[PDB]
Amino acid sequence: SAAHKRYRRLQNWVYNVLERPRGWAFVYHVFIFLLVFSCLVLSVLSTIQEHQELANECLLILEFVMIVVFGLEYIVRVWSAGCCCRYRGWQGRFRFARKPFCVIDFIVFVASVAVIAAGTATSALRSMRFLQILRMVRMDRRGGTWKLLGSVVYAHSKELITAWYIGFLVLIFASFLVYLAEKDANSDFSSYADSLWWGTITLTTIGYGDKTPHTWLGRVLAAGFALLGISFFALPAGILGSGFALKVQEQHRQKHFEKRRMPAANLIQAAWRLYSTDMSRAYLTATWYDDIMPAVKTVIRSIRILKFLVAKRKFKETLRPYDVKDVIEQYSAGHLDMLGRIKSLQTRVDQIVG
Amino acid sequence: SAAHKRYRRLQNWVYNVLERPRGWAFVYHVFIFLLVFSCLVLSVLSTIQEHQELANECLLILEFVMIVVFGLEYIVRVWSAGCCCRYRGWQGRFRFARKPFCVIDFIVFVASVAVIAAGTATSALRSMRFLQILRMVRMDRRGGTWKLLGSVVYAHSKELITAWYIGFLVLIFASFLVYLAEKDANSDFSSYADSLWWGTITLTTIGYGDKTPHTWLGRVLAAGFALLGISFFALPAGILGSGFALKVQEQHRQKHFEKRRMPAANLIQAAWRLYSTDMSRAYLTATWYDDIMPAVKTVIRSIRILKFLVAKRKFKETLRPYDVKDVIEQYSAGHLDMLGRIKSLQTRVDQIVG
Amino acid sequence: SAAHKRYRRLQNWVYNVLERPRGWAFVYHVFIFLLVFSCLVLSVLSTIQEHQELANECLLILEFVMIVVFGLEYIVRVWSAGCCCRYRGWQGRFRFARKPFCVIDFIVFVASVAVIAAGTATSALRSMRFLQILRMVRMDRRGGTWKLLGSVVYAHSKELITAWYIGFLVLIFASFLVYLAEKDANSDFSSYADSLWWGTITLTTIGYGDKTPHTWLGRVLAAGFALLGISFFALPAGILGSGFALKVQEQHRQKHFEKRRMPAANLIQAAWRLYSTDMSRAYLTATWYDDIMPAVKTVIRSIRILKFLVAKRKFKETLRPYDVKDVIEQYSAGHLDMLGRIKSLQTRVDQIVG
Amino acid sequence: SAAHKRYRRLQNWVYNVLERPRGWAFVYHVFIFLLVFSCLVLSVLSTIQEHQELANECLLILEFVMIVVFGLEYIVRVWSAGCCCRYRGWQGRFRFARKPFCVIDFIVFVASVAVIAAGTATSALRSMRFLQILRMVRMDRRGGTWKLLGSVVYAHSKELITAWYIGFLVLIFASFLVYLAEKDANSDFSSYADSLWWGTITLTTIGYGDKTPHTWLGRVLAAGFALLGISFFALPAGILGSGFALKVQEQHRQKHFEKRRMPAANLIQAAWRLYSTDMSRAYLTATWYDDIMPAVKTVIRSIRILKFLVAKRKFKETLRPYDVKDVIEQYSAGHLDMLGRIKSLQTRVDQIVG
Amino acid sequence: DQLTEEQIAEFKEAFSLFDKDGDGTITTKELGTVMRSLGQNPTEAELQDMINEVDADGNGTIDFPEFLTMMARKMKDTDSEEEIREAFRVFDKDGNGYISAAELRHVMTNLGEKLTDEEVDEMIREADIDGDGQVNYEEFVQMMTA
Amino acid sequence: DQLTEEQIAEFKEAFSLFDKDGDGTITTKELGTVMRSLGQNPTEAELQDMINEVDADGNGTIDFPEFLTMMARKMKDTDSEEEIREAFRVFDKDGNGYISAAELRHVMTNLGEKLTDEEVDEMIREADIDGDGQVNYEEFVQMMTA
Amino acid sequence: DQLTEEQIAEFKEAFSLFDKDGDGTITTKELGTVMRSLGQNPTEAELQDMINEVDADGNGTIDFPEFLTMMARKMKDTDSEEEIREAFRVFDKDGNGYISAAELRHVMTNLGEKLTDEEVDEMIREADIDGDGQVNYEEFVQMMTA
Amino acid sequence: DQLTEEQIAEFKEAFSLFDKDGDGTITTKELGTVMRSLGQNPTEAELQDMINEVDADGNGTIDFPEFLTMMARKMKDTDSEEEIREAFRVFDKDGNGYISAAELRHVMTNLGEKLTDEEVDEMIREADIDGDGQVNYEEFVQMMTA
Ligand SMILES: CCOC(=O)Nc1ccc(NCc2ccc(F)cc2)cc1N
Ligand SMILES: CCOC(=O)Nc1ccc(NCc2ccc(F)cc2)cc1N
Ligand SMILES: [K+]
Ligand SMILES: [K+]
Ligand SMILES: [K+]
């Protein structure tokens, strides 16, 4: 079946490059990226009334190439999933197709093909070009980015609220004070809404320049308020950046410990020992041939099941992190064992000599 | 009294959702927020001369709804406070009302009602719309944000002062140097005050664009000073952000230790044991029936009071943080106890055999 | 001499409030600050041709008040220095005056008085108003800010150098590329120097708006370069901020240890014991009355000098920080002492019983 | 040969100042920097049509001086390389010249000389002035900056990707929403491309001011979107700065440990002991004069080679970092040795007395 | 609850059981001797901690004014009410001022100086337990501080 | 694989070897006694861990319903399949679902409760090893979970 | 205070009590022997530290030039005045150059090589204590450095 | 320096002193026995480390091809020259490729497996010391790697 094994190795390699890339497999995904992103850009260049002609021309070719490439990729991935043992036979392939992102990719492809077909309602045929962004959104494996951002935001919720509350009060105050000074002299600050627009555009440090204070009082107040206001607005970015950095550092820290080890290795052993209870040559002897006292072998199996369950638990626990108080715990164990050893010496000296 | 207990549970639930929210109770507070904030926005849209009509219309309805909702909330909270044992009876309700933020909320509500009544001095009836911001200010439970900001600012005083001193010097020098170069060619830099305004608006990175250097010397001098100046102005934000992040991390650190534990549990026990001295069946026997030697039971109670006071202290202390030198202390205790054990062996061997 | 001691306490209090403030003494220095800074502002308002009249009026009064206040402060500080024992008598006062910042303050005061006198060359009488900034520069006690900034910059030299080298390369390349595209269509980019000015003003995120790309190639090229360029330019403000924060945290860390302790206390004791060799009642006995064998007391003194010198060294060393490897060192000492104790048991058992 | 040793010391000093500067040697390199950078600036001032005359004049002199200085420096460095033992004789000098940056410097110099010669195609003679930037690029010793930046970027890949993905989605959305509101009223937002240009220029906080929202709906949407958008765009700069700071701190941490020590010292000893097997006076005796049993000395040498190889390995290993679990390992070793010691006591007591 | 003179005399008679010599002070010797006569076995460090809680002079003794103050006060002070209530709140994660009867039972018999079953039975009987099985501990704290 | 009544009776007969007194429970005494009769030597802490894996009542015993559940289930549950597959993945750095025969042999005989040579020989024989010498462990996991 | 020749001869006579053999050096043997004759009991490590403070040659000895320098200097040098003043400042939190008589007494008798009551009584008598009970320690440092 | 056949035979004769049985291998027994006969006293862990440096088969032995490779190579390889030069550079703070004769003497006799005085005397004699007293260690490394 050497050909069968070559087939299986090819399948596993393709599935590895598609589902979970590593090392050089990226050279594929990046490509796909630059293929969709590029298309997006062209779509935007279609909106300008100056380049519409050439842009539509290029978009025709690019959409054709993209539809062909994504159809090929989809067929290849659906065939590759077969490598794993979970999805075998056409029933298994179907079970694979039922995944959400798979049907998403299929829907996007069928939409692209139907659009290019109807091309031969141009407004809708242009509007659906936004669909490609779903091809990128599909790159998120279970929304990792959203979950990471949410975790980091929640961990610093108290610090973030303080920056917004202090920043909002300064914007409401500085806007009011500057509006009070520029009310009549300058025409820009006709109403309070204009003052608030100016205050936001200034405190964020955007500084469009369509509204600026003209009288000296307004300038002094603006300069004094901007220094206090600019720092509060720029805090969230710094807080979140330091949070991300510290999180990455601590995580990388735990990589060195490698404490889980031994539990995973023992679990496979307890599972093999349990499994082999029912097929090992160790039980294919006249002695074991079950007819007179079946319970003996059943009792031996029951013990292996209990040990398997202990090993599965110890294995699952390894994932959980451990504290730095273990050193105190080993001293407690070491001292207690030694103190008990001196007692056992003391009792024997007192027994013999008295 | 099952109905009485249902009543008490309802009261405690309402008081929990109002005073100290957790989990899903937030779905209430957020609502109130979006109800006041929205009103604020409408008030601002009243200032524009274009939308005044529709804005006042909407503000009428929104003020009506807000007054009704806040009256309901206030009555409900005043009735809910009764759940706790501190404020019982109408005397207790009154004691509850005497709180500062409660009277604040009441004053704001009465002001809103009086305003809407006088509506049927419109300038003042518009001016008092600012009052609602107090409804948000009321969300601060004892000014937590101010205290946090003050702590973090005080802990980093030296670096912060260094950033301002270097930043102030650079600003003065750059403004003067650029004014010396742009004095005659450009009309913007007519006086030193204009140069200072330009220097601030540039170094903060706002960049309005109403004043810019025109001669090449000014540009070169402005370019170099701008690069050095921009970093110093943004230094505060980064310092405070890193400070907040590090503080949050270290605080989260101490949460894992949970060292306080045992003291709180023992305090309740010493308090119960002291209390039960005067009501336990253990003392309702012919033996204890006090007539011949009252002092014996009094002495037993005096001992329980002393132990209660020891447990209260140990309980208060647990809140205080503990150092990482405890491991050295346990080794010192462990070594000393063991070294004393070998001495006790040595003395007994020397006693019997000599 | 109770009056003498009241005098000395008053002197020490004044000198404490002036030289090294703490707690509430700040309420003085801040005042002086707001007194000089204010003056500065008025000077600037003198440059405008609109407010010159009122500004000069206010500056007259403020300069009078400032000269009087600083003369009073200088006399008070020169008299207060006498409290310490270093500068006693008029020779000591003179020695105090010889300090650099003292003569600086004196020169500034004499300059102010000479200026106000010549007031009754107005250009110079206005130019010297810059002198007041020296009053603030004088607030630096031995240039602490400069030394702190230099330390933090030197510790991070490599990372800071990387940000400038990458940022400079992005600036050159982006300026050249945008100039190549905007050369003919737009008039702003007439020469490469204009492109470099635009590139700096954009990458620093100032964005004056006097130069902007007009053709789409320039716009797409500028948008891509600005995203890469903006992060590198703002990279230094973040590195230095994180450095300051980490430095403050680690420093605060060592404050908790308080490992220096015991050495300072022992030094005073060895110094007192050495000093008392030559005046203690312990040596004023017939026995010690020196005539027959003077060397005995000299030898006793020589030993106390050697112990004093050991205590002074151990005291100076405490200032130096200590590593976290001490726990390993105490285990090494503890294990070795215990292993030697079991050997001493083993040898005695082998001696008696054999 | 005292003159020979003076020669060698001079050579080593020059090579130290050139190849690897330290301390005061920098006072040279900085100079060279200010000599090339200055030239660059002058070249730029040549592009302006106002200063071309004086700029070309100054550039002539500066190019002459620079060519002379760099020729001198190159000859001196090529002669200095001889100090090391690797490159000796003209063959060794040649081997030194074959280095990449050496030939780079030589090519740049020959290009400068050929240009100044052809000066007596001016367009090319101006274009090649860009070459000098290679003189700075040459300051990178094996592209340290690029490698550092790449390491820090790769370590923070997951955090960086989240900022880009969230930021890209906000930019696509805010631009579309603002374009929908400003479509007809304002002429700036004629097409979607204009809205995207505005969105980028706004979110990066550049704020040119050539495009701004005019209707109030657009202003409100721009205000809310910019606050969310500005933080995400500045998130990458915040993450890389904290990363650099943390990396520098941890690196400085390992400097204090100084754990490598002992291995380097032992390696030199094992190498000397092996080397001296074949030349020591210890082997120049009648006993060792090899004729009857040569293998004895060969066996002794084979043992020294094996020990040398053990010492070389232990020396290379020291460079690798070590974990903080060593304390647990020393307790394990210490406890085990002591527990075995109590066993040896127990067995001897049981042997003699029984 | 003004402290009366007969109440003072009864405290004095208890104080004199400790200070049998009439020296006006209670040291670790006098305190620990009375305690061990009743079958208690405090350590020396526990006797020092107990005396230190009321020894303002810091000389290792309790005098009658300190003894009388402790006896008159018991747990009625506001510091005691707050700290006891803070101890219950350690075990109230909901923050609603309630603790389960079964959770109170676990903490009382499994942590610290564990209550016996009969002690904890009397404690749960004394709290007016709700029908669910939840205890409002803040009214439990006021009964011990009354 | 519906659990039949004869299968239940065979489990009951094994359960009764442990619980020879007919008390309906297996403690560490009954479990450890049967184990040591076969020449095994568990520790007390190992006997407690084993019973704790199936003791829902938390009273340190196994009753027949818990015994029957464990015996009927073996490793067929989805939790077992996932955790065993996660254990192999610890040693699959490529992430391709493969492990070398020689690497499996090293881990099985050098880590944990090491397999003997004959045990590990039977294990590698049972996996359908590819011609390269690489083992697809996810189909190995389904054979032990079937 | 120029060092005179008679003062040098008196130092020489003390130096010769240590170096009784006339070898011109003081080792730990000579130093420790004289010290123990007076009833002191330094350790070997304390004798090495003492000699190391004045042994510039680093060979574990004190010669007469080193002995004479130490004896002529005592505590009069500026390094001694500064370090002693820095030690007091450890216990001056106000930063005003004052320390309480009672705080000085606590530190002198409770930390380090504690002073006896009589030693510390003489020390507080010698400082010109103010009527409040506060000690200006910087003038106390100049009296020991004079 | 092509390895000749007579040089190979002399290595073979040394190899046979270790492997006296003719088994073609050197274990810790054979290596340590020859070493102790010369009065050396390696530990078992030191004998394992030595064999492990040249045992490619990982079975705890040295065969003749491994022995011959080690003997032919000595320290002449580029890895040896670089690592020895890196070891000197640990003690060259200036970075100029020099080390003081007195500093070399301190490191050789005070760290590691200290050289005796006579060993270190021969080492400093062999380096062509400059008149200042500074040693160019990179030419010292080439003499040991030649
Ligand atoms: C934490 C709240 O935010 C700030 O601390 N803001 C801030 C304060 C000062 C400076 N330095 C420039 C300067 C200082 C004083 C002057 F009088 C004029 C200019 C910069 C910032 N960003
Ligand atoms: C700590 C004080 O603040 C700064 O370090 N400022 C700063 C310095 C340089 C750069 N890199 C761009 C650049 C470098 C060299 C040039 F010649 C032209 C441009 C950016 C900033 N922000
Ligand atoms: K900006
Ligand atoms: K801007
Ligand atoms: K602008």
UniProtKB/Swiss-Prot annotation, chains A, B, C, D:
Q: Where is this region: Interaction with CALM?
A: 264-273, 301-315
What highest taxon heads this organism's lineage?
Eukaryota
Transmembrane segments annotated in the record for this chain: 24-45, 57-79, 96-118, 125-145, 158-180, 216-244
Query: Mutating residue 20 to A leads to what result?
Result: Shifted activation curve of KCNQ4 toward positive potentials compared to wild-type. No difference in current density
Phenotypic consequence of residue 184 to G: No effect on inhibition by potassium channel toxin SsTX
Q: What is the effect of changing residue 158 to A?
A: Loss of detectable current
Gene Ontology terms for molecular function: potassium channel activity; voltage-gated potassium channel activity
Membrane topology category:
Multi-pass membrane protein
Keyword list, A-Z: Cell membrane, Coiled coil, Deafness, Disease variant, Hearing, Ion channel, Ion transport, Membrane, Non-syndromic deafness, Potassium, Potassium channel, Potassium transport, Transmembrane, Transmembrane helix, Transport, Voltage-gated channel
Instruction: List the stretches on the Extracellular face of the membrane.
Output: 46-56, 181-192, 215
| Result of changing residue 255 to A | Shifted activation curve of KCNQ4 toward positive potentials compared to wild-type. No difference in current density. Shifted activation curve of KCNQ4 toward positive potentials compared to wild-type. Decreased current density
Residues annotated to bind a 1,2-diacyl-sn-glycero-3-phospho-(1D-myo-inositol-4,5-bisphosphate) 1? 20, 99, 141-142, 147
Q: What is the effect of changing residue 268 to A?
A: Loss of CALM binding. Impaired location at plasma membrane. Decreased KCNQ4 channel current
Annotated GO biological processes are:
inner ear morphogenesis; potassium ion transmembrane transport; potassium ion transport; sensory perception of sound
Protein family (similarity comment): Belongs to the potassium channel family. KQT (TC 1.A.1.15) subfamily. Kv7.4/KCNQ4 sub-subfamily.
Domain free text: Each channel subunit contains six transmembrane segments (S1-S6) with S1-S4 forming one voltage sensing domain (VSD) and S5-S6 contributing to form one quarter of an interlocking pore-forming domain (PD). The CALM binding domains correspond to the first two membrane-proximal helical regions that interact with a single calmodulin/CALM molecule forming a clamp-like structure. CALM N-terminus binds to the second helix in both calcium-free and calcium-bound forms and regulates channel trafficking. CALM C-terminus binds to the first helice in calcium-free form; this interaction is disrupted by calcium binding which regulates channel electrophysiological activity.
Q: What else is known?
A: Mutagenesis experiments were carried out by expressing in Xenopus oocytes KCNQ4 mutants either individually (homomultimers) or in combination with wild-type KCNQ4 (mut/wt homomultimers) in a ratio of 1:1, to mimic the situation in a heterozygous DFNA2 patient.
Q: What is this protein called?
A: Potassium voltage-gated channel subfamily KQT member 4
The coding gene here is KCNQ4
Full-protein positions shown: 74 to 588 of 695
UniProtKB/Swiss-Prot annotation, chains E, F, G, H:
One annotated GO molecular function: calcium-dependent protein binding
Gene that this sequence comes from: CALM3
Q: Could you list this entry's UniProt keywords, alphabetically sorted.
A: Acetylation, Calcium, Cytoplasm, Cytoskeleton, Disease variant, Isopeptide bond, Long QT syndrome, Metal-binding, Methylation, Phosphoprotein, Repeat, Ubl conjugation
Residues modified as N6,N6,N6-trimethyllysine: 114
Q: Which residues carry this modification: N6-acetyllysine?
A: 20, 93
Binding annotation for Ca(2+) 1: 19, 21, 23, 25, 30
Modification sites for N6-methyllysine: 114
Q: What else is known?
A: This protein has four functional calcium-binding sites.
Please explain the role this protein plays, according to its UniProt record: Calmodulin acts as part of a calcium signal transduction pathway by mediating the control of a large number of enzymes, ion channels, aquaporins and other proteins through calcium-binding. Calcium-binding is required for the activation of calmodulin. Among the enzymes to be stimulated by the calmodulin-calcium complex are a number of protein kinases, such as myosin light-chain kinases and calmodulin-dependent protein kinase type II (CaMK2), and phosphatases. (Microbial infection) Required for C.violaceum CopC and S.flexneri OspC3 arginine ADP-riboxanase activity.
Q: Which organism is it from?
A: Homo sapiens
Q: Where is the EF-hand domain?
A: 6-41, 42-77, 79-114, 115-146
Q: Which CDD domains match?
A: EFh (cd00051)
| Chain sites annotated for binding Ca(2+) 4 | 128, 130, 132, 134, 139
Q: What is this protein called?
A: Calmodulin-3
Q: Where are the transmembrane segments?
A: none
Enumerate the residues binding Ca(2+) 3: 92, 94, 96, 98, 103
Q: Which GO terms describe its biological process?
A: calcineurin-mediated signaling; detection of calcium ion; establishment of protein localization to mitochondrial membrane; G protein-coupled receptor signaling pathway; G2/M transition of mitotic cell cycle; long-term synaptic potentiation; negative regulation of calcium ion export across plasma membrane; negative regulation of high voltage-gated calcium channel activity
Concerning PTM, the database record says:
Ubiquitination results in a strongly decreased activity. Phosphorylation results in a decreased activity.
Compartment(s) of residence: Cytoplasm, Cytoskeleton, Spindle; Cytoplasm, Cytoskeleton, Spindle pole; Cytoplasm, Cytoskeleton, Microtubule organizing center, Centrosome
Instruction: Using the UniProt entry, state the residues involved in the cross-link Glycyl lysine isopeptide (Lys-Gly) (interchain with G-Cter in SUMO2), renumbered to this chain.
Output: 20
Q: How might one describe the regulation of this protein's activity?
A: (Microbial infection) Inactivated by S.flexneri OspC1 and OspC3 proteins, which specifically bind the apo-form of calmodulin, thereby preventing calcium-binding and activity.
